[PDB]
Amino acid sequence: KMRKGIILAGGSGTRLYPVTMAVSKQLLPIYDKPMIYYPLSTLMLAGIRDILIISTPQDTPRFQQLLGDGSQWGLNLQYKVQPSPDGLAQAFIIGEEFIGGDDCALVLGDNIFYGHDLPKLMEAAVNKESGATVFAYHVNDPERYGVVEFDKNGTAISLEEKPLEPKSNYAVTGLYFYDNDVVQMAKNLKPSARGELEITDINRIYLEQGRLSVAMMGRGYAWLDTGTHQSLIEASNFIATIEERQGLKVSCPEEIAFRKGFIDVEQVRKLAVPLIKNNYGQYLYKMTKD
Amino acid sequence: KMRKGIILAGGSGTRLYPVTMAVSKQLLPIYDKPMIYYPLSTLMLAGIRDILIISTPQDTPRFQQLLGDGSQWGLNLQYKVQPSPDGLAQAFIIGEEFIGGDDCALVLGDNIFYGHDLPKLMEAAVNKESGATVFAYHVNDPERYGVVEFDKNGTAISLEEKPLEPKSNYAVTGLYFYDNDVVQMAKNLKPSARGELEITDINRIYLEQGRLSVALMGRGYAWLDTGTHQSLIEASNFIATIEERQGLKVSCPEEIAFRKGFIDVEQVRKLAVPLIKNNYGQYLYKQTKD
Amino acid sequence: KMRKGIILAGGSGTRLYPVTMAVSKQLLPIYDKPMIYYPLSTLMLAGIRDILIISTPQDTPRFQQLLGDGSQWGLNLQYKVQPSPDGLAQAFIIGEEFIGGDDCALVLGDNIFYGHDLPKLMEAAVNKESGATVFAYHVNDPERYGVVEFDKNGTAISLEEKPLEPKSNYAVTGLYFYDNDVVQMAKNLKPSARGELEITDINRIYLEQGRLSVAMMGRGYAWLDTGTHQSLIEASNFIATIEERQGLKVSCPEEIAFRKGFIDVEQVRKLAVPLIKNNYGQYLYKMTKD
Amino acid sequence: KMRKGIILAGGSGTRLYPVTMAVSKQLLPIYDKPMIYYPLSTLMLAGIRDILIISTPQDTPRFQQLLGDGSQWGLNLQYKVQPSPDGLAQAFIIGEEFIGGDDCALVLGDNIFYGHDLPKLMEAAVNKESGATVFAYHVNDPERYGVVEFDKNGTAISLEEKPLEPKSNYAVTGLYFYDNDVVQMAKNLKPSARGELEITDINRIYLEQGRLSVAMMGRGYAWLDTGTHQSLIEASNFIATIEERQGLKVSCPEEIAFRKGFIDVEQVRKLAVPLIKNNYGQYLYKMTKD
Ligand SMILES: Cc1cn([C@H]2C[C@H](O)[C@@H](COP(=O)(O)OP(=O)(O)O[C@H]3O[C@H](CO)[C@@H](O)[C@H](O)[C@H]3O)O2)c(=O)[nH]c1=O
Ligand SMILES: Cc1cn([C@H]2C[C@H](O)[C@@H](COP(=O)(O)OP(=O)(O)O[C@H]3O[C@H](CO)[C@@H](O)[C@H](O)[C@H]3O)O2)c(=O)[nH]c1=O
Ligand SMILES: Cc1cn([C@H]2C[C@H](O)[C@@H](COP(=O)(O)OP(=O)(O)O[C@H]3O[C@H](CO)[C@@H](O)[C@H](O)[C@H]3O)O2)c(=O)[nH]c1=O
Ligand SMILES: Cc1cn([C@H]2C[C@H](O)[C@@H](COP(=O)(O)OP(=O)(O)O[C@H]3O[C@H](CO)[C@@H](O)[C@H](O)[C@H]3O)O2)c(=O)[nH]c1=O
Ligand SMILES: Cc1cn([C@H]2C[C@H](O)[C@@H](COP(=O)(O)OP(=O)(O)O)O2)c(=O)[nH]c1=O
Ligand SMILES: Cc1cn([C@H]2C[C@H](O)[C@@H](COP(=O)(O)OP(=O)(O)O)O2)c(=O)[nH]c1=O
Ligand SMILES: Cc1cn([C@H]2C[C@H](O)[C@@H](COP(=O)(O)OP(=O)(O)O)O2)c(=O)[nH]c1=O
Ligand SMILES: Cc1cn([C@H]2C[C@H](O)[C@@H](COP(=O)(O)OP(=O)(O)O)O2)c(=O)[nH]c1=O
**∠ Cα D258 D264 D266 (to 5°):** 125
- A169·B247 Cβ contact <8 A: yes
* Residue C105, beta-bridge partner list: C5, C177
- 3-state SS, residue A177: strand
Per the annotation, binding residues of C for Mg(2+) are: 110, 225
CB C56 within 8 A of CB C81: yes
- 3-state SS, residue D39: helix
Mutation pick for ligand 6 pocket among B114, B219, B221 (CB with most ligand atoms within 8 Å):
B219
Which sign, positive or negative, has the C-alpha torsion C250, C251, C255, C258? positive
A257 Cβ inside 6 Å of ligand 6: no
The CA distances from residue D2 to D44, D133, D268, in Å, are: 11, 19, 21
Instruction: Of A289, A264, A285, give the one whose Cα is nearest residue A73.
Output: A264
- For A237, which of B223, B237, B245 is closest by C-beta distance? B237
A255 Cβ inside 6 Å of ligand 6: yes
- 3-state SS, residue A227: coil
How was this model experimentally determined? X-ray
CB A246 within 8 A of CB B139: yes
DSSP letter at A266? H
- 3-state SS, residue B258: helix
Ligand with minimal distance to D196 CA: 4
CB D199 within 8 A of CB D125: no
- 3-state SS, residue A105: strand
Buried b (16+ CB within 10 A) or exposed e, D268-283: bbebbeebeebebbeb
CB D271 within 8 A of CB D69: no
Neighbours of D58 (CB within 10 A): 11
Torsion, CA B186, CA B191, CA B194, CA B196, rounded to 10: 30
Pick the atom of ligand 4 nearest to D200's CA. 28
How far is A166 from A143, CA to CA, in rounded Å? 6
- B247·A117 Cβ contact <8 A: no
Q: In this structure, which amino acid lies at residue C208?
A: E
Residues spanned by the domain of C60: 1-290
- For D23, which of B27, B37, B277 is closest by C-beta distance? B27
Torsion, CA D9, CA D12, CA D13, CA D17, rounded to 10: 160
CB B30 within 8 A of CB B41: no
CB D103 within 8 A of CB D5: no
Instruction: Of C286, C131, C108, give the one whose Cα is nearest residue C205.
Output: C131
Sequence-separated (6 or more) residues with CB below 8 Å from residue D137: C246, D170, D171, D173, D216, D217, D221, D223
Pick the atom of ligand 1 nearest to A199's CA. 30
Ligand with minimal distance to A224 CA: 1
CB D139 within 8 A of CB D168: no
Task: Please provide the DSSP assignment of A24-51 as one string.
Answer: -GGGSEETTEETTHHHHHHHHHTTEEEE
For ligand 1, atom 19, the nearest C-alpha belongs to A145
Chain-centroid distance of CA B31 in Å reads 18
For ligand 3, atom 19, the nearest C-alpha belongs to C145
Query: Pairing relation of β-strands C132-138 and C212-217?
Result: parallel
- C66·A21 Cβ contact <8 A: yes
Q: Give the Å distance between the CA of D216 and the centre of ligand 8.
A: 18
CA count, 13 A, side-chain hemisphere, A151: 4
Pick the atom of ligand 6 nearest to A255's CA. 25
How far is C229 from A254, CA to CA, in rounded Å? 19
Q: How far apart are the first and last CA of chain A?
A: 32
- 3-state SS, residue C225: coil
Instruction: Of D214, D16, D35, give the one whose Cα is nearest residue D108.
Output: D35
Query: Pairing relation of β-strands D76-81 and D48-55?
Result: parallel
Report residues whose beta carbon is within 6 angstroms of any ligand 3 atom.
Answer: C 8-11, 26, 82, 85-88, 108-111, 145-146, 161, 171-174, 196, 199-200
Neighbours of B167 (CB within 10 A): 15
- A240·C232 Cβ contact <8 A: no
- A116·B244 Cβ contact <8 A: no
CATH of the domain at D62: 3.90.550.10
CB A37 within 8 A of CB A46: no
- For A22, which of C34, C229, C232 is closest by C-beta distance? C34
Chain-centroid distance of CA B247 in Å reads 25
Torsion, CA A136, CA A140, CA A141, CA A147, rounded to 10: 20
How many distinct structural domains can be found in chain A? Answer: 1
A114 Cβ inside 6 Å of ligand 6: yes
Phi and psi at residue D243, to the nearest 5°? -70, -40
- D280·B18 Cβ contact <8 A: yes
Neighbours of B279 (CB within 10 A): 15
CB D79 within 8 A of CB D63: yes
Task: State which residue of chain D sits closest to C283, comparing Cα positions.
Answer: D140
For ligand 1, atom 16, the nearest C-alpha belongs to A145
Q: What is the resolution of this structure in A?
A: 1.9
Q: Is A55 exposed, middle or buried, given 0-12, 13-18 or 19+ CB atoms closer than 10 A?
A: buried
- D247·C169 Cβ contact <8 A: yes
Give the distance from residue D155's alpha carbon to the nearest chain C alpha carbon, in angstroms: 17
Range D189-196 contact pairs with CB under 8 angstroms and sequence separation of 24 or more: D189/D87, D189/D89, D191/D86, D191/D87, D192/D87, D192/D161, D194/D161, D194/D162, D195/D86, D196/D86, D196/D87, D196/D88, D196/D89
Pick the atom of ligand 5 nearest to B45's CA. 6
Q: Is C255 left (phi over 0), alpha (psi -120 to 50) or beta?
A: alpha
How far is D57 from D62, CA to CA, in rounded Å? 10
Instruction: Of B222, B197, B224, give the one whose Cα is nearest residue B84.
Output: B197
Most distant pair of Cα atoms in chain B: their distance? 57
D123 Cβ inside 6 Å of ligand 8: no
Ligand with minimal distance to D88 CA: 4
Q: Give the Å distance between the CA of A221 and the centre of ligand 3.
A: 40
- For A247, which of B118, B138, B245 is closest by C-beta distance? B138
Q: How far apart are the first and last CA of chain D?
A: 31
How far is D82 from D60, CA to CA, in rounded Å? 9
How far is D126 from D122, CA to CA, in rounded Å? 6
A248 Cβ inside 6 Å of ligand 6: no
Ligand with minimal distance to A175 CA: 1
Per the annotation, binding residues of A for Mg(2+) are: 110, 225
How far is B281 from A88, CA to CA, in rounded Å? 40
Task: State which residue of chain A sits closest to C62, comparing Cα positions.
Answer: A22
CB B128 within 8 A of CB B160: no
Q: What Rg do the C-alpha atoms of chain C give, in angstroms?
A: 19
Report residues whose beta carbon is within 6 angstroms of any ligand 5 atom.
Answer: A 218-221; B 41, 45, 114-118, 250-251, 255-256, 259
Phi and psi at residue A108, to the nearest 5°? -80, 150
- 3-state SS, residue A216: strand
Instruction: Of D110, D10, D2, D114, give the one whose Cα is nearest residue D60.
Output: D10
Contacts of D141 in chain C (CB under 8 A): 247
CB B66 within 8 A of CB B103: no
Pick the atom of ligand 4 nearest to D194's CA. 17
How far is D203 from D215, CA to CA, in rounded Å? 13
Task: State which residue of chain B sits closest to A168, comparing Cα positions.
Answer: B290
Instruction: Of D52, D40, D44, give the one whose Cα is nearest residue D81.
Output: D52
